[PDB]
Amino acid sequence: TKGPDAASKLPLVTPHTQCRLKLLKLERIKDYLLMEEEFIRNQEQMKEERSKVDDLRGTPMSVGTLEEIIDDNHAIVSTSVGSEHYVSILSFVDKDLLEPGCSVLLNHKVHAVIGVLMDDTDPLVTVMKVEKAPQETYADIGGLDNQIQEIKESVELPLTHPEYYEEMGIKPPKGVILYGPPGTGKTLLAKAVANQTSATFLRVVGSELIQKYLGDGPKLVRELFRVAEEHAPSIVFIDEIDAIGTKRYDSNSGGEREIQRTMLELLNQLDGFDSRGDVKVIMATNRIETLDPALIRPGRIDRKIEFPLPDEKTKKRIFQIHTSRMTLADDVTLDDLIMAKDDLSGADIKAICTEAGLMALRERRMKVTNEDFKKSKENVLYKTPEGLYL
Amino acid sequence: LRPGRIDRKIEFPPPNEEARLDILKIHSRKMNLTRGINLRKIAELMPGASG
Amino acid sequence: LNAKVRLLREELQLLQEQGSYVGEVVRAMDKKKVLVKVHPEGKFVVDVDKNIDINDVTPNCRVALRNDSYTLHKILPNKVDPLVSLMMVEKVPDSTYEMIGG
Amino acid sequence: DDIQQLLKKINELTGIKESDTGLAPPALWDLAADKQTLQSEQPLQVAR
Amino acid sequence: DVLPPMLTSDQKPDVMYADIGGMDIQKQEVREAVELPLTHFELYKQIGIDPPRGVLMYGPPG
Amino acid sequence: EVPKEKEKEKVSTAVLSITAKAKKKEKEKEKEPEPNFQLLDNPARVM
Ligand SMILES: Nc1ncnc2c1ncn2[C@@H]1O[C@H](COP(=O)(O)OP(=O)(O)OP(=O)(O)O)[C@@H](O)[C@H]1O
Ligand SMILES: [Mg+2]
Hints:
This is part of a larger assembly, with one copy of chain A, two copies of chain B, one copy of chain D, one copy of chain E and one copy of chain F. Chain B is built from two helices and no strands. Chain B has helices at 19-26, 39-45. Chain B is elongated, with a radius of gyration of 16 Å. The two termini of chain B are 26 Å apart. Chain D is mainly alpha-helical. The longest helix of chain D has 12 residues, at 2-13. Chain D is elongated, with a radius of gyration of 22 Å. The chains are: A alpha/beta, B mainly alpha, D mainly alpha, E mainly alpha, F mainly alpha. The interface between A and D is medium-sized, with 41 and 29 residues. The structure holds adenosine-5'-triphosphate (ATP) and magnesium ion (MG). Residues 140-144, 182-188, 239-240, 284, 318, 321, 346-347, 350 of chain A line the site of adenosine-5'-triphosphate (ATP).
């Protein structure tokens, strides 16, 4: 329960089109940043008893795991060898931080209690922690307005307006799936939440909760959710949950049962016996028909958001987004692609724009043309018999 | 295969005519060919043959 | 002759010095202190020496600790998973664009 | 480019915290605790 | 020190070319594919060929 | 001579990209031979 961590993001100069206004704004960023760096360097360069006490402290402090504190100055600790000891307790510890399972610090020679290390989170989870601020705010999310509204109600509003719900006793949703075809914005709508959310964001990948050591997966999951609850009123983004989410079956192998165990621990965390704090789960998947009702349940996953292949208006707005930063030719009408009802994803629109720019560059030009868009679509698109209907 | 992870998808069609000739030359340079070897004729005699 | 004699002598003197363990830094907590886990035993905190700056001790990096006093004394070439570290291409294949046609 | 490099430089200058380490506040410590570190190390809990 | 460090190809075979009868064509082809690249590779350089590493044998059950 | 302990000075103001502009604006608005003898005394430190 340390409190929210979130991420540090510098301000975003509003202009994108190459402009002296953009230059001026970005030089404003530069000058304040240089000023911060100055203050740091200046003050920290321009500008006893505890020193000797910490010297007495064993220099190569080891880490054990406390077990069954006894008395006031004699606590039992362990070691990373399977052995354990009835070690002494010095006068340097704050005390009251020593609880069973606590990763304690110990002296190399004396093997006493010389610390508590109330900071031990597994590397496999701290690396997954998010501290960058990916610049994907809710401006490049063409259309998808209903999905963004739902996700905003789920994630933002019980942080920036915790009065609507308390006014009427209702409690905010705890989980949201984003499910759909290959390329719709299910990950952009997570990136933008990371951007505008002042709460900690936690990457997660389903293929990351499957661990080699038997029983380690349903401990990594506990570590993940304990870090989420302890460290922040946060958000946990399990991308590609179909990596562990498949329906539980009887199975006849060890690995499948272990994966199912990881699922069960995830479910116990989402809605177990005890409770859940202010951790909001955002899950992503390409197929929702291949998941366990256990995790698709509306107690752990209170909202489900389809991401259907964007319609005509959304597709228009997506070309708008992904060509805005390009030198367009006046002879280009961004409707030839719109009108055709060929399955076009948001990623497909992005690839069309990129490929079109490339064809122009090959034509020795730096501004798109209608023929270039036509060739780009034709050479980008990847993939009922006639007359069976009508 | 989404155009977000694999952006471009090149195809390698079975060498057509005179592309088969190019491959014949490439893999027959380090060789001892007589005056009167027609790598073109070899190409036609090889229809639809991969590299 | 003096140069070669002295080189051999210094080599012997420096080679008679005890080695150092190789562990991985879980996280660089505080300047001059690093929480590093050294295989196969548990994880210890260190007393980083003066010859490498703390900023270069990033998490998940291989650090050598003096076998005596467990003092970090280098930033080893961070690397993991030999299964794949034996995967980067060292020898450039011999095929050339001139070997393709059509 | 140099804004990015200055971000890197400031993160190098700072970005490391002193951590908890369980150090106590004063008025409750002990000096001349050498009695401990002169009588200690009891490797029991492995006795049954 | 570097200690000079197995599984197969140490139970030295016994059958021989005098033992195998007939199949002169098969012996020729398998040899040109398997042995000569290892004994006379100059013959292959002269023609300017890549030795055929890899051959497959058809045939009834035995 | 006693080394005059110098004040702990800082780094320059760095280029805020209009520092030089401001300085220029303010500026514009404002607009023994050594001898060849010694004559040593009677006890002479004659090296
Ligand atoms: N509404 C949108 N506006 C702009 N780009 C979009 C939009 N929806 C999707 N994209 C494109 O999506 C790409 C990222 O992949 P996306 O989030 O769509 O994948 P996904 O299939 O939903 O999820 P996952 O990444 O888990 O496979 C970005 O390149 C972005 O161009
Ligand atoms: Mg995505």
